[PDB]
Design a protein around this motif. Structure first.
Motif, PDB file in Angstrom:
ATOM      1  N   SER A 122       0.734  -1.359  -0.156  1.00 20.31           N
ATOM      2  CA  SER A 122       0.099  -0.058   0.047  1.00 20.31           C
ATOM      3  C   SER A 122       0.808   1.202  -0.071  1.00 20.31           C
ATOM      4  CB  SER A 122      -0.944   0.073   1.108  1.00 20.31           C
ATOM      5  OG  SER A 122      -1.889  -0.904   1.314  1.00 20.31           O
ATOM      6  N   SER A 124       0.616   3.853   2.415  1.00 23.15           N
ATOM      7  CA  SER A 124       1.161   3.937   3.557  1.00 23.15           C
ATOM      8  C   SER A 124       2.354   3.095   3.840  1.00 23.15           C
ATOM      9  CB  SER A 124      -0.015   3.770   4.799  1.00 23.15           C
ATOM     10  OG  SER A 124      -0.321   2.210   4.501  1.00 23.15           O
ATOM     11  N   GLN A 154       6.231 -12.949   8.513  1.00 20.06           N
ATOM     12  CA  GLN A 154       5.572 -13.418  10.062  1.00 20.06           C
ATOM     13  C   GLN A 154       4.087 -14.144   9.497  1.00 20.06           C
ATOM     14  N   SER A 156       0.973 -15.990  10.286  1.00 15.86           N
ATOM     15  CA  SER A 156       0.152 -16.362  11.260  1.00 15.86           C
ATOM     16  C   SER A 156      -1.143 -17.367  11.195  1.00 15.86           C
ATOM     17  CB  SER A 156      -0.441 -14.823  11.658  1.00 15.86           C
ATOM     18  OG  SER A 156      -1.495 -14.788  13.086  1.00 15.86           O
ATOM     19  N   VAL A 157      -1.129 -18.029  12.059  1.00 12.24           N
ATOM     20  CA  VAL A 157      -2.146 -19.024  11.941  1.00 12.24           C
ATOM     21  C   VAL A 157      -3.280 -18.960  12.702  1.00 12.24           C
ATOM     22  CG1 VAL A 157      -0.947 -20.943  13.162  1.00 12.24           C
ATOM     23  CG2 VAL A 157      -2.673 -21.657  11.538  1.00 12.24           C
ATOM     24  N   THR A 158      -4.542 -19.084  12.562  1.00  9.99           N
ATOM     25  CA  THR A 158      -5.815 -18.942  13.331  1.00  9.99           C
ATOM     26  C   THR A 158      -5.911 -20.259  14.296  1.00  9.99           C
ATOM     27  OG1 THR A 158      -7.345 -19.923  11.763  1.00  9.99           O
ATOM     28  CG2 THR A 158      -6.736 -17.313  12.018  1.00  9.99           C
ATOM     29  N   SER A 170      -2.165 -16.144   7.321  1.00  9.33           N
ATOM     30  CA  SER A 170      -1.821 -14.766   6.754  1.00  9.33           C
ATOM     31  C   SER A 170      -0.114 -14.619   6.884  1.00  9.33           C
ATOM     32  CB  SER A 170      -2.723 -13.812   7.634  1.00  9.33           C
ATOM     33  OG  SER A 170      -2.267 -12.332   7.292  1.00  9.33           O
TER      34      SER A 170
END
Lengths: 183, 350, 5, 194, 323
Positions: A122, A124, A154, A156-158, A170
């Motif tokens: 993005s 930003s 990084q 990340s797993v739910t 993610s």
């Protein structure tokens, strides 16, 4: 008296009603001081098994186990949906007090191809990072293909989403400004 | 799980089911086990198995420079090799499993326990440790010799330390209570001191609660309340005397007006660490100098009404109301009005 | 001679 | 019987604090008191133990020389005074009760409190659209997020630690909006269009 | 001169040295007896404590303290005031020699009581506790005190005050001489010799020999070092008792046996030196007992050190699980 307690496996897949066998092997001789606890995500652990043969009060009869030498096996004759938690083995005889590694019981499901979504950087972030979103897949081990050398990502797993027993990842890869045109 | 102990020679090995024997007044847990020997090594010899008991009486003069007199209360001995045909013919499940596992190399033995034996209770060690303890010792000893009266061989002897264990009863009676009345020639009006407990049966680690009531019908003012928990440990065999061992004390400074009443619940917590290394304190028996708790109260049948050699443990609490007016019996004199109340402190088995 | 016994 | 830990939160390395464990429904004369810690990504390990009846206090090797503990037997309240804090002490601390007369293992449990040892100051979040909307550079945890004022395929991911010491949050929506980010430790409400 | 016949010739430096030894032994014995009484009070909290041993120790300590406290002023007056041996009246002389002989009999009976108590404790451990009690112990202590008081009675009748100076009316010449004939006084002296020194020497010697032989046989048929110290103490007590309590009666036998035609000034001065050595041996006997009690007893040694601080193979077993 540092006893190395090797718990195995680190995770396993199973269905409801299956007999689950989880082993915990001590590095030294532990005659009777064997305990097993069950911890839920975000909750305090409870005591399930005590002294390798006695069932603790309030624990259902489906949990049992047996010892051979230094290797103890915890047996679940009929796996329940509420038993999908983390199990720990523990000794309480020698100083210092040691502990296991933690076995998480997962739901056995069919293999599903992931839905992969690519998110560019993005404005930003530039004033970079790319995101790979993996939806509705099984098992947890899957190959992430970046849209482009491995950077700092990084992953990340739910927790396992009970609506369909699938997983979601993610993976955010932090990159430089020069990698914006490459990705 | 069963326990095992081998000889220094390694030819003799004793297997016992457990080391802690839980008995009651009527029912006792019998002693069972097996001894494995080498038939090609112990030729033309005799192997015997005995259950022995001993007491090591200690004195203050003996502690400084003396030898602990050891006295055997009881001693039963059976022959294990060659086997006696008059012995018990059926086997227990322990003995059946041990015979089926080991074969003809092992021989079983059983021993009975008389109901008039003291519990495995020892005394508090002194600041300097001799290395030999003081109290009731039990052991199971197997030995091999050509001559029964040979007491010098060590390498063909196996000895195991066992403990006599009693469990707290599950049928408590009424709440214990006591009351005393004090009257003097200088003051004819009575002073009534009553104390009651919340339960008769206590567990190890349970603090005690006492309801103390004071009725003061005279002109004296209560100065303090000293509640003392004592172990009345008595050995009949040593002498006709009973020690009043200090265990706990609580000094409350709550005063009471003259010609008035008072009622208050107090809580006492007998910390063991306060009574560390104090001579005369009896504790439960332990192996290899490990930590142990306070000695449990000894259960004795009322019907028997017989004395018991060794240490008999009983706990009583006394409530000493220290009251004074000044001048009636002296300016600095006071009246200590005290009443005792028994209680039982044991450890539950389940 | 001494005088005291 | 209840066991309530108190005294957690965000502290600085090199400082000191007092963690209490209040109790009800029993007396510590009947029990042994144990402290254990759960590191992030790790299991439970022993920290300290107090045996009131035996009056014996035992300490783990990793905490000897820095931490101390006492207990109020008239209130049954454990008081662990912590000194010389380091970054590895960030963990969830559980206070537990075991039977002394028979070692039944862990029996009574509290829910534990989280302690975070970090020199980083409180900083507001940076929120930006990615369809997702990422939140980065916030401290301390936790942070909450509302998608389309709660009216909205939403995948919420657990927070991770950045190398700078700050936290990040991955939040995406699967769609073939409004992002209300509430940083509760700083009460920062960022309303970002997605 | 009125006091020309009272001059006793001695080395002044020897008098100073013996006076300093007397003062040192008096202070050491007094502190020993006071600390012994304090330990005797402090040991009441012991549940298994033998109160009869406490009674005998307290009686022996009281006897040693009373003999030292009575002995020091009069002996210092006699040794310093050689020209005035007794300014006080006949009543004071009779009362003090009565109390000194009674305290001597009391400490002799206390040492004999401790000896027979340890004899019963070692030779017959069952009967020593079965046939003894605290009431019988207190009765025996009161009985031996009354026996000492009854045996000290002839000192109040066979000795009085006379003037034996050159001046027949002189305060300096007052001296304690027998008022009855020499023959019956010597009879009384022989009875006090038999009751004071010979009988407790026989009792102590026989009892300590039997206890030494019993300790030699019993423990054999750091313990050997303890047995050696035991034998050494059991010998030292008998030896010190004999060499300290013999001159108490040897001086009186020297006085009563030597006739007027046999006395010399050399024998006069040797009698005075022998009386000085006798009193020195009395102070040694009354001083060595708390030091010996500190040596034999560890608890008493520890409490004395606290008072001084206040002033300043095994084989592990195995287990198997049935299958």
């Amino acid at each position: 008296s540092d006893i190395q307690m090797t718990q195995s496996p680190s995770s396993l897949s199973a269905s409801v009603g299956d007999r689950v066998t989880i082993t915990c092997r001590a590095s030294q001789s532990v005659s009777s001081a064997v305990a097993w606890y069950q911890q839920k995500p975000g909750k305090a652990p409870k005591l399930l098994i005590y002294s390798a043969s006695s069932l603790y009060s309030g624990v259902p009869s489906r949990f049992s186990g047996s010892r051979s030498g230094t290797d103890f096996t915890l047996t679940i004759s009929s796996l329940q949906p509420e038993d999908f938690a983390t199990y720990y083995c523990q000794q309480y005889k020698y100083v210092p007090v040691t502990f296991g590694q933690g076995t998480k019981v997962e739901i056995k499901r069919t293999v599903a191809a992931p839905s992969v979504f690519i998110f560019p950087p993005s404005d930003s972030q530039l004033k970079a990072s790319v995101v790979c979103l993996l939806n509705n897949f099984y098992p947890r081990e899957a190959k992430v293909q970046w849209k482009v050398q491995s950077g700092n990502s990084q992953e990340s797993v739910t927790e396992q989403d009970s609506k369909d027993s699938t997983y979601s990842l993610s993976s955010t890869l932090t990159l430089s400004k020069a990698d914006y045109e490459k990705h | 799980r069963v326990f095992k102990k081998a000889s220094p020679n390694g030819k003799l090995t004793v297997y016992l089911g457990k080391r802690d024997f839980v008995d009651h007044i009527d029912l006792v847990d019998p002693v069972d086990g097996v001894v494995l020997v080498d038939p090609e090594y112990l030729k033309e010899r005799r192997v015997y198995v005995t259950l022995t008991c001993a007491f090591r009486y200690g004195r203050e003069d003996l502690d400084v420079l003396g030898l602990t007199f050891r006295k055997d209360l009881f001693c039963a001995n059976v022959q294990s090799f060659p086997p006696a045909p008059e012995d018990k013919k059926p086997l227990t499940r322990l003995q059946e499993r041990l015979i089926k596992k080991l074969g003809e190399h092992a021989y079983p033995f059983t021993f009975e326990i008389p109901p008039n034996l003291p519990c495995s209770v020892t005394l508090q060690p002194g600041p300097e440790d001799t290395g030999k303890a003081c109290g009731v010792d039990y052991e199971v000893k197997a030995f091999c010799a050509e001559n029964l009266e040979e007491k010098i061989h060590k390498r063909n002897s196996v000895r195991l330390v066992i403990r006599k264990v009693q469990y707290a009863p599950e049928r408590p009676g009424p709440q214990p209570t006591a009351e005393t009345t004090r009257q003097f020639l200088m003051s004819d009006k009575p002073l009534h001191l009553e104390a009651s407990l919340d339960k008769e049966i206590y567990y190890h680690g349970e603090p005690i609660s006492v309801n103390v009531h004071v009725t003061n019908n005279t002109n004296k003012t209560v100065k303090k309340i000293k509640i003392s928990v004592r172990q009345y440990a008595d050995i009949c065999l040593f002498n006709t005397a009973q020690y009043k061992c200090p265990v706990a004390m609580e000094e409350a400074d709550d005063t009471v007006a003259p010609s008035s009443t008072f009622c208050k619940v107090y809580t006492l917590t007998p910390f063991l660490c306060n009574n560390r290394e104090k001579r005369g304190l009896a504790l439960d028996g332990k192996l290899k100098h490990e930590d142990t708790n306070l000695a449990s109260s000894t259960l004795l049948r009322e019907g028997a009404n017989r004395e018991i050699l060794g240490i008999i443990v009983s706990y009583k609490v006394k409530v000493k109301l220290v009251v004074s007016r000044g001048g009636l019996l002296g300016d600095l004199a006071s009246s200590d009005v005290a009443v005792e109340l028994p209680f039982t402190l044991m450890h539950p088995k389940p | 001679r001494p005088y005291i016994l | 019987v209840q066991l309530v830990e108190s005294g957690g939160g965000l502290v600085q390395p090199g400082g000191s604090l007092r963690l209490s464990c209040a109790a009800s429904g029993f007396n510590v004369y009947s029990s042994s008191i144990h402290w254990v810690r759960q590191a992030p990504g790790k299991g439970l390990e022993w920290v300290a133990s107090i045996s009131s009846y035996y009056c014996y206090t035992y300490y783990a090797d990793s905490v000897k020389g820095r931490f101390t503990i006492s207990a109020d037997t008239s209130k049954n309240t454990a008081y662990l005074q912590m000194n010389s804090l380091r970054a590895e002490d960030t963990a969830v601390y559980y206070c537990a009760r075991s039977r002394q007369f028979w070692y039944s293992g862990l029996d009574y449990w509290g829910q534990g409190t989280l302690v975070t040892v970090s020199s980083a100051s409180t900083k507001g979040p940076s929120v930006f659209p990615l369809l997702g909307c990422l939140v980065k550079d916030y401290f301390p945890e936790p942070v909450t997020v509302s998608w389309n004022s709660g009216a909205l395929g939403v995948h919420t991911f657990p927070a991770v630690l950045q190398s700078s010491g700050l936290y990040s949050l991955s939040s995406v929506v699967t769609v073939p909006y409004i992002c209300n980010v509430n940083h509760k430790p700083s009460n920062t409400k960022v309303d970002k269009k997605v | 001169a009125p006091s020309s016949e009272l001059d006793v010739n001695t080395d002044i430096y020897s008098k100073v040295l013996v006076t300093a030894v007397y003062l040192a032994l008096f202070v050491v014995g007094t502190v020993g007896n006071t600390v012994t009484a304090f330990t005797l009070a402090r040991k009441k909290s012991l549940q298994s404590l033998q109160s009869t041993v406490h009674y005998h120790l307290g009686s022996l300590a009281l006897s040693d303290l009373l003999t030292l406290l009575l002995a020091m002023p009069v002996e210092l007056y006699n040794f310093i005031w050689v020209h005035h041996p007794w300014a006080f009246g006949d009543a004071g002389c009779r009362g003090y020699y009565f109390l000194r002989d009674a305290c001597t009999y009391a400490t002799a009976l206390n040492v004999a009581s401790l000896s027979v108590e340890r004899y019963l404790a070692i030779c017959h451990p069952f009967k020593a506790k079965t046939l003894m009690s605290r009431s019988r112990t207190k009765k025996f202590i009161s009985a031996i005190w009354l026996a000492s008081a009854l045996l000290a009675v002839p000192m109040l009748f066979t000795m009085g005050e006379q003037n034996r100076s050159a001046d027949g009316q002189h305060a300096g010449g007052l001296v304690c001489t027998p008022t009855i004939h020499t023959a019956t006084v010597k009879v009384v002296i022989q009875v006090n010799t038999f009751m004071s020194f010979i009988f407790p020497m026989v009792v102590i010697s026989v009892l300590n020999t039997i206890i030494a032989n019993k300790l030699t046989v019993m423990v054999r048929q750091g313990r050997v070092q303890a047995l050696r110290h035991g034998v050494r103490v059991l010998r030292a007590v008998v030896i010190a008792f004999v060499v300290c309590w013999l001159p108490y009666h040897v001086r009186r036998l020297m006085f009563c046996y030597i006739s007027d035609e046999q006395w010399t000034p050399f024998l006069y001065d040797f009698y005075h030196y022998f009386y000085m050595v006798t009193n020195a041996l009395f102070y040694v006997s009354s001083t060595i007992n708390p030091i010996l009690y500190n040596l034999v007893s560890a608890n008493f040694r520890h409490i004395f050190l606290a008072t001084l601080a206040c002033l300043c193979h095994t084989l592990s077993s195995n287990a198997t699980r049935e299958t």
